C-alpha cells in the first residue's frame, strides 16, 4: 500500500527535457513533502521521447546517488553533470 518503482535511462542532448521541484533547498512540490519531484516534461525532449518519466514522480536516486533528502540544487548539479547517460530511480502512485 504505497507507490511503485521504475527506472529512467536518459541520454543528454543540447538537456534531459524535464524539470524538478521541491527538495530541501527549495519550495516543496506537495503539501507536506520535501522530496524531489518531476514538475514537468518538455514536449519533444529526451525524456518525453523515452516515455519513462511522468509529472509527479518522486526522484529517489540519480546515477546511484540517493536524493530522497538532498537539497534541490544538489540534485540539479547531479542532473546536469556531464555524463553519457542519467539513470533515474522513480516512485509513482
Amino acid at each position: 500500500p504505497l507507490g511503485s518503482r521504475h527506472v529512467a535511462c536518459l541520454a543528454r542532448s543540447e538537456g534531459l527535457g524535464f524539470s524538478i521541484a521541491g527538495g530541501k533547498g527549495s519550495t516543496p512540490y506537495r503539501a507536506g513533502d520535501a522530496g524531489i519531484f518531476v514538475s514537468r516534461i518538455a514536449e519533444g525532449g529526451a525524456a518525453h521521447r523515452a516515455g519513462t518519466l511522468q509529472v509527479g514522480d518522486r526522484v529517489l536516486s540519480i546515477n546511484g546517488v540517493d536524493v530522497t533528502e538532498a537539497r534541490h540544487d544538489h540534485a540539479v548539479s547531479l542532473l546536469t553533470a556531464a555524463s553519457p547517460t542519467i539513470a533515474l530511480l522513480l516512485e509513482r502512485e
Partner: peptide, 6 residues
Amino acid sequence: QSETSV
C-alpha cells in the same frame, strides 16, 4: 525560481 529545468 521554484522549478529548475535540466
